[PDB]
Amino acid sequence: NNYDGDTVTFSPTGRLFQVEYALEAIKQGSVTVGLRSNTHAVLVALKRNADELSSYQKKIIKCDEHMGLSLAGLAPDARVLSNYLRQQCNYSSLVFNRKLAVERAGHLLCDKAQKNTQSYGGRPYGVGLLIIGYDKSGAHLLEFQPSGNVTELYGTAIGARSQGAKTYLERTLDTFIKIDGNPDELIKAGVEAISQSLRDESLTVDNLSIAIVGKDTPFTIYDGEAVAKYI
Amino acid sequence: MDIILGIRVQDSVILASSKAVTRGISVLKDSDDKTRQLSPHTLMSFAGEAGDTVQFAEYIQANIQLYSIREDYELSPQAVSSFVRQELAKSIRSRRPYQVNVLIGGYDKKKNKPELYQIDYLGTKVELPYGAHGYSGFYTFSLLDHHYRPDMTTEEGLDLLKLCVQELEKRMPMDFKGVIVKIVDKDGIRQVDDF
Amino acid sequence: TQQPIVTGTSVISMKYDNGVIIAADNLGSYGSLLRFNGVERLIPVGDNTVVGISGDISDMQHIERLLKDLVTENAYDNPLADAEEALEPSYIFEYLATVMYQRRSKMNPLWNAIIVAGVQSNGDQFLRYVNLLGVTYSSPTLATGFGAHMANPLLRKVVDRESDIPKTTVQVAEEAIVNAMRVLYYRDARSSRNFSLAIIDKNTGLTFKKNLQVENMKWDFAKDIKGYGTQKI
Amino acid sequence: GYDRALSIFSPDGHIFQVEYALEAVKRGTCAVGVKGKNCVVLGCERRSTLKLQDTRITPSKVSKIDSHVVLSFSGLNADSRILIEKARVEAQSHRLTLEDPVTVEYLTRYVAGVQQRYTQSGGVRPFGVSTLIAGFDPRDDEPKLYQTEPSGIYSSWSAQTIGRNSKTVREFLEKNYDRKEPPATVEECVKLTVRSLLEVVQTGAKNIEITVVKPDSDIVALSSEEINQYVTQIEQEKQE
Amino acid sequence: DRGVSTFSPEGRLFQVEYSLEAIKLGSTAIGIATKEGVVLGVEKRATSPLLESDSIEKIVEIDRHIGCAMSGLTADARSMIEHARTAAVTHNLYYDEDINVESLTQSVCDLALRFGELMSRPFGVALLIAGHDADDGYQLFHAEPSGTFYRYNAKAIGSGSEGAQAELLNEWHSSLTLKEAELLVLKILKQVMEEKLDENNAQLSCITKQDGFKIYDNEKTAELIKELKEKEAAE
Amino acid sequence: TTTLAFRFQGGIIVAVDSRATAGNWVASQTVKKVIEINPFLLGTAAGGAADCQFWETWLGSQCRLHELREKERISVAAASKILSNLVYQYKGAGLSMGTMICGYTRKEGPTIYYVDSDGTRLKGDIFCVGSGQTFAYGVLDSNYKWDLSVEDALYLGKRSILAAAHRDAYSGGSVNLYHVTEDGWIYHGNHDVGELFWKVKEEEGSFNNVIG
Amino acid sequence: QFNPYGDNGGTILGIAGEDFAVLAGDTRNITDYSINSRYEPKVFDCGDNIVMSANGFAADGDALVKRFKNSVKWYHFDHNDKKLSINSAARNIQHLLYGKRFFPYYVHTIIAGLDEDGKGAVYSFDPVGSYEREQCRAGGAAASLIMPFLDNQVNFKNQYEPGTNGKVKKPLKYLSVEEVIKLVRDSFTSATERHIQVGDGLEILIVTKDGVRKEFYELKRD
Amino acid sequence: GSRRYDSRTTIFSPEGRLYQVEYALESISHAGTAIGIMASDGIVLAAERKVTSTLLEQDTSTEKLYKLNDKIAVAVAGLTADAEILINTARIHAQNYLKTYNEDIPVEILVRRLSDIKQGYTQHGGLRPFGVSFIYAGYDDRYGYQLYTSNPSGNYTGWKAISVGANTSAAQTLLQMDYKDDMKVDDAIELALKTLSKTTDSSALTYDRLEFATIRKGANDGEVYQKIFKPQEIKDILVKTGIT
Amino acid sequence: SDPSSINGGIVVAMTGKDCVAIACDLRLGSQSLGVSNKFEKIFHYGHVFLGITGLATDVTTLNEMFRYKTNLYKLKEERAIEPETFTQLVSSSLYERRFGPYFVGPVVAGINSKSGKPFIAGFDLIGCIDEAKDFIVSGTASDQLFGMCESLYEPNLEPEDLFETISQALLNAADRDALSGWGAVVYIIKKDEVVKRYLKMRQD
Ligand SMILES: *[B]([O])([O])[C]([C][C]([C])[C])[N]C(=O)[C]([C]C1=[C][C]=[C][C]=[C]1)[N]C(=O)C1=[C]N=[C][C]=N1
């Protein structure tokens, strides 16, 4: 009300409204799902188009051979943050000959987003990210919020109508975690999960976007007729 | 480059500058004009290190032309010479100094007097009746000391200048491929096409 | 640009079937003066890596502090700091190699020659060299300074190529290292009798031996040597 | 440093600071530009509220940017000096590097770019100035006339006016200027320019300035008596 | 007052949303992509008859294989074009090749959100970036001041955009020829324009693999306008 | 290195050798010492290979940007001055370049500028640059006229490089010919000196000193 | 005074075939009169069917290769996983080298692969970035021993056809991968005999449309 | 943050006026009247000190008339402290020009430079403008005797006779009435004092409430002399002209 | 190479009874080449006189600099600068270029307008003040000038007698220096009149 003019101002109940407004931009964004087993980690993203003549906005970005994310909200802010991750993953490789841990990648994103919430002049990031990766401690899935809060999860979903996919994963928890050494079945579960967030529209060939990373599987993105198999 | 001369007579200033450009063992050009018009009644000849000479001359030219447009007025030769000196005096204590020597010949329309200024790369200015840079003065000043007269005509000045160039062509080791001569008077600047 | 002041001499090392061995004497020389007699030049990092350093000692102590600080930093926000996300020999080396090449590129080098010896997560032997110029190389045997000229020849008779590594036991390898240290004491004018030795085995872990001495020296034949040619008495 | 964003968008998609800068131009004295077949003429209004003025030394409204290009303006006088100075510097810089004087279009594009830069830079307000830039490209006999404004947009004009009561004189020019046959001579072009100002000026005494620019750096400013003869002839024909 | 980089309660940047309103006031620009090429067309919209219309430059070359049309505060586009040209040429210098149309667009869109309290406000102009490369063929992009860009088979921006987009919705198919696309841009421009469409108040351009980016002459466009009139009268 | 360029009735002839050396070691015989800046501009390369290559392909980028911005072909004067102003900024740092910027425009006609790493920029009709420049000058100066046919001018340029290739130890390999006209430059082939020498000797009756 | 440069010896060789390309290099690494390593890889697979080697000062060589591999990675990120063509890689390397014009990478760089028409390609660089596409190039310590042999046996220089006596040249018939590998092995065997910094082992990387293959051969260890 | 407290000194009003410039001009209108009159053989500068005291040391006092160089002087109207900042900048600029070109700075060039500084404060920096209006009286060999004025907007204009500060409307009407082109310095002195005597808010015009100065070619042969009048000399010229 | 002896030249100053005298030669050269015979080395700012020897570009630069500073002084102070004060200003100005100095040998001369006391002073290139009662010397023939002044000088000389002493000191010193001569100027300075005399000397 009087305390939402900038990010440097707490409200009387101890809230940061500019951060909360940035969180709102994520809810307006298109749905994306993340889940993992012990061997593989999968991202499924519903791409959004402007109209029938337009293309479908890309949702998934590769950060390294073993890591990447899906976005929901302001796409340019996802480009800035993914560019930062790319650099940090790269610094770890060049200097220490070491693939950056997914947990440490989350810690770096958290600290970058935080500085924008405590300083005058700047603004919070207007995007939420789902980071998947395979490192020395196996498969991982992270959820990034522009408040700074990063959380490691078995599965999750962000964006519009994401609550439906999140409930499905909460039921299926015991099943999909056990899908080891079978990428196609893990993707099937992810496609079935994102389907719980659909209304009116259905998954078409240029609508769906899938990405996977695992034990002997580099981070690869599937679009077009490559995902027709899963429709 | 090599030889640049200047002489101030009754009603004009005459500048003579060599045409040769030599890089090492070869004369790459024999028709080079080592001068720039700073303003309608002010001419500057130059000689020094390769590249620095032209870069400096054109830089000065641009600054004086800028002044002329801004004020709709031509600076006096004395004023232009002072500006040039200060740039060279500034330059000599720089990271990489301009290695350029100049003669500034101008006609002051206010005082109705020709004026010749000699400035070296250190920023050493002197007003003179006749001047030279490099090894040129070693030959030509003795002739000018004898023959010069403050009230010579322009034609007499050119004859005395021919006597200087003849002596240079006789006693200097380097073939400087003759000189381009330019006259600065009340009517402006013109080139003597046959010399 | 500087000059080295207080200096350390040869560091020698080799691979064997189940791991790597590395050694270096405990002297800190000040030109021709053998100034400091209790200097440890092998610095362990965790329980899987030993960094042996020769050259300028002030720079060695700086590097020692960087490694100490590296362990601290790696533990930060790292629940697997003593397990899957522990510091590997390859990580420690690449870091040093980066620093060495950066410092030579600013014309202000760390005046050292460094050998990182260790065993990786998968049991593989790690042994690689780096120096003040940022030059790096790996070999079944590695040595710095005088060791390069005298130790390597001896150690290469045990392990001449890659296929000789599985055929070399820890007893045979340690024997070769200890002999090489004796030879260096005979022939290096900036060496000492006292030295330290470290073994990093994939089974038995890190064994760090201090206060070792060169023994079984041959000097008795000296009594028969008289004059420089013609002299008999 | 002072970094405050003064020029910003409003809910209806307007940048008020740029629009208020146009209001400063509206307040300024009228300026007009007309191009003939082989010339361009720049007419300017002098408000006669200020007498006891020294016309020798008072800053003239038309400014030479180079020997072949001129610039007149409407709006804040102090602001115009800054644009003129930058333009003059760029003109000499172009000669120095390209070894050729600026085209009229290039000089206009530069001045327009400066004006634009001041609409999205921190800590600065836009220029309260619109300009008319006229001249002839080097070794070219085609007349050139361009206009700029605070926003930074620029364009070429057969004839154009800016400043106070510019709506009226633009009305005059739109009916009187024929594209198929423009003012063939200097006389015809000057006459049409003086006529257009007489729709707005008041008295035809010291209130009208005229500057004629011809090809090959031929620029001259008309005197009071020369302009007064045009004023006399126009009204004598009008009495009919 | 309030921050320039402030979020609204709905989760949108005030300044970005306000710049979009400025773009709606701008003159119409239309782009259509085909397998034979991409066509770009604009409404010039001269404020007065004395304004020489040929000086209105709302279609612009970035490189030989990339063209660009603009709508909104067109003065703001000059620095964007300069950056685009520099990026295109710089990439050719570094990599001895043409730059991908998408990569060029991305480079331009990186400037968009560089505003705060960098420049003082977002750009008040939208761009239609059309081009060709060997990997993804003929392409058309819509670059906004939000930093977002969408690829399009066909797109209209400016004051008559939603009316034109609905028309493009019906008319576009994957087998359109270049000639068919040229006429289609002229048809839709004529529909949404206030003044009557002719060769002086409207401009066409195209990008093909063979000839590259070309702005059409007024004589060439005039013929296509005459060809349009006859084919509409044919039924 | 031997490179030359000269103005004549039919435009400009540009001719260069192909050799590159590191001390006495012949590093390459197939070096492209002419650079195609655009369909109307050529640049020659003498001195440091990298310096010349790098900054002349850079020059082409600046020329392309000029004609994108100004909707007009860049003048030879302006193109040459961009390069001379650039190297002047680096003066003292150790750049080693001797170049001719050759082209034709409507306003200038056929034009040649000598540009050099000391900052020297000279317009002229004839230039020879490189370690074998003196050898090329001998043939050029004695046979040059304004009224030369494209065919005869081309041969003179080819012959002048051959003269220098023979005598200068740091020149040789092959001859690259270009002819610059009203409608742009035209490449005229790579001519191996090992075959060209014997051909010219036999047909021309020259080099009677050498035995063949 | 501190000397930031050193010489690690070694020698490398690139040959371009009709539909293939090879980049070879010995595995010995040295300083002065000592051997550092008998097997220290010098030719590297950099991705996108490109092989690279930077011979001379090994610290600068490793630094450059590391930076180019990095450039390939970022080329994929910035340009939608587009394959970096050999000609584009070459131009990119020029800028990496010239970027340190006044404090150079003290190396002789060679890259090899296939051009966009599928034909074999080799590019050669000097330390400060000048480059040129070539059919054949040796680099490093024993380059002066090997290049003349390759002028003779790859480009048939100074060779003519019997009976004609100097009139008709030997025709430039194409060489198979088996024929090229023979010439590479003989080049290094000959270089090893007469150059002290060459020996220990020979590692060859062959590039075809199918990918990158490796072959290793023993060399004399003295 | 800090935005909350920013006055925004460099913005336009909806009418296209610069708020701070307009308000600075309002400030200057309450300052003591300063008059400049240009004649054929010289220039006069006259100015009124504001409500003084008997205990003010007049002979060592200076609030209105300042010397920029030997050829150029200024009369001040507004904040004295603001004026002195600008005066010292102007003095330096004149010395820079003299060092560069070895010639005394032309009057207009000095005026333009100070006027450009004032303009800068109205367009950028977020600072308040200088609340000062100057009358420049000077001589050079191009245009001869010259009078200029500048104000907080940075705009400057040339004049034959001009007033700044309080009651300029009344003062300008009186000057416009009695001024003629063939006028001389002695006549201009009388006009300046008569104008102040009628426009003054004080009961009577006395020597202790005035600062006076002339720039004359009345110096021995072709050269220019500046005369800053002493208290006793102002008293004498008041008796001579018949005001006291 | 040595900056202080490229152009050549000399300055000398002396005190007398209620008067001071300062004198200099007129030569400017480029090592062996004589270029100008009109290059005066004595300048004045109000009643304070400054002579400067050494590198000619710095001689010109410093004159322009002290003219600059004394003009601002006069505007602010509302009085002409005095010799004692000016001496301190020269010292300050030279020392601020401690590690990049002007290659000059300044000499101040003048009479204090209030006390009437004659004043002279000399400096090295970096600011050190030599405030002598009798005389100051500077330039390429400083050794020669020291020898002449130390023998010829006596205290309390009348203006017209002091002229002869200083003139003979300069002339004979210059004639034993290759880089000095080509004319000479002498200033005789009293409390409210200053006479300037050009001397006839050998032109070699
Ligand atoms: B030419 O001889 O100037 C030639 C032209 C260059 C563009 C290939 N230069 C060189 O051959 C130089 C050496 C040189 C010899 C004689 C005069 C000046 C310079 N060689 C190189 O620049 C070079 C580059 N890469 C490898 C080896 N040498």
Ligand SMILES: [Mg+2]
């Ligand atoms: Mg060998």
